[PDB]
Paper text:
The StSurE protomer has a Rossmann fold like structure similar to those of its thermophilic homologs. The crystal structure of StSurE reveals that the C-terminal helices of the two protomers of the dimer are swapped.
The activity of H234A was only 5% of that of the native enzyme. The structure of H234A StSurE could not be determined by molecular replacement with acceptable scores using the Phaser program and StSurE monomer or dimer as phasing models. With this truncated model, a solution with an LLG score of 905 was obtained when two copies of the truncated protomer were placed in the asymmetric unit of the H234A StSurE. The final model of H234A StSurE consists of a dimer in the asymmetric unit with 244 residues (out of 253+14 N-terminal tag) in chain A, 252 residues in chain B, seven molecules of ethylene glycol (added as cryo-protectant), 248 water molecules and two magnesium ions. In both mutants, the two protomers of the asymmetric unit are related by a rotation of 167°. The 5% activity of H234A might be due to the presence in solution of a small fraction of molecules with a dimeric organization similar to that of the wild type enzyme.
Numbering used by the authors:
A (entry chain B): 1 to 150, 152 to 253
B (entry chain A): 0 to 199, 209 to 252
Write the structure that this text describes.
């Protein structure tokens, strides 16, 4: 099996390195990842710019200031030969759940993979410690794909930050929007300045049975068959009719 | 009358948001909640479990320190504007948000965060850096249009305004998002040191703007399919638990 492995956290990240080592047990892996951490950066293709690459002794390739999508696009069309069987993104440091999948770099890489024509998977750890757990989950998932090739959608995977033995299973999920347990909690700093803290005062619950949120709350691996489509083709007529009805733009 | 949460991507100081704010305060109740800095080229995720500091300006505008556009809208909608906003408006952005650019756009991200409100959210971008007055006039017309006849929610309108005087705007068209990406390729290049450097429709938003029309694209969040949910679940139960 041939894997194009990228991430959002960059080539030296523990998530991608833990995943790369576990995958090389059964698969041939090409890493093409950003040269540095990209979590805070936009995830679009860098158009009309000459991107420099760096090749390490182990074969990993770093794209200088490349986004996750740059890495997949350059990997597919220039850097990886022979071409990959599947594009993998992760393991991300932190969850990619609900509305955040629209904005996630980890997700964006997998999406670019699918747009280019390859099966694609994105993996995220809901925490900071148990990358081994997330690695084991990804390997088991990729085993299944080798045995039974699969949808023109990506698989968005979220893993609880727990030892592997405590993960209560794997669920096929839909995406939530924002978590009902998250709240705006007012805070003050030592200087008396106003601060706001977004999240749960206690445990995260009431998320909804089949959401990606709930699955992770209940200690389950969340798997979402995902395709970020923002278009609203059915709404075109209703907006047209509304503009004529109220006469918007007809008063200039 | 209307309660408008106004945010953007360019930050609280941007000429686009400042022009728009002034215009909207003529007929509406406006609260600015915007990033403390320009966020173009930054990611748009929600900042969870990390305290966000706010600055309040003399005029009542609120800046969120290291706040993403979604942080601003989330905070505005749920804490900073009371009673709750009827609508989120995001812009006026300096530069277009057309076609392939909309997914990663901070301007559109802010609107998307405000999509569950009483009115659909507006993301407004000027196709340039000059005629902010035009884009503000367009936004005002849209808002009044929603007052007279409310349009349904869970949705946003992505609005791109041509960088022209208002008298030169040819009209307003409902469009779809274009895509120039299925035409891109990779052309290698030679550095002076030697190393290789790699280089990457009539109803489209691009076309409307190019022809001097304001582009209005309805957007909706669609992520999953019920048939995909079934085909993955049966694919999972093919290879289950075990102890092997
Ligand atoms: Mg990251
Ligand atoms: Mg901007």
């Amino acid at each position: 099996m041939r894997i194009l492995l990228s991430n959002d956290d960059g080539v030296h990240a523990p998530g991608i390195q833990t995943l790369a080592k576990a995958l090389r047990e059964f698969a041939d892996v090409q890493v093409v990842a950003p040269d540095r951490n990209r979590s805070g950066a936009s995830n679009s293709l860098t158009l009309e710019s000459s991107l420099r690459t760096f090749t390490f002794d182990n074969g990993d390739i770093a794209v200088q200031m490349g986004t996750p999508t740059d890495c997949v696009y350059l990997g597919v069309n220039a850097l990886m030969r022979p071409r990959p069987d599947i594009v993998v993104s992760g393991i991300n440091a932190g969850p990619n759940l609900g509305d955040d999948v629209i904005y996630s770099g980890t997700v964006a890489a997998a999406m670019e993979g699918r747009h280019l024509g390859f099966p694609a998977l994105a993996v995220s750890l809901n925490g900071y410690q148990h990358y081994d757990t997330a690695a084991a989950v990804t390997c088991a998932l990729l085993r299944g794909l080798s045995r039974e090739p699969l949808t023109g959608r990506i698989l968005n995977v979220n893993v609880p930050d727990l030892p592997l033995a405590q993960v209560k299973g794997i669920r096929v999920t839909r995406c939530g929007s924002r978590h009902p347990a998250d709240k705006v909690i007012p805070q003050e700093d030592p200087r008396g300045n106003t601060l706001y803290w977004i999240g749960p005062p206690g445990d995260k619950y009431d998320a909804g049975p089949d959401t990606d949120f709930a699955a992770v709350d209940e200690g389950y691996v969340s798997v979402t068959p995902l395709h970020v489509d923002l278009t609203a083709a059915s709404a075109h007529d209703v907006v047209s009719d509304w503009l004529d009805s109220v006469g918007v733009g007809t008063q200039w």
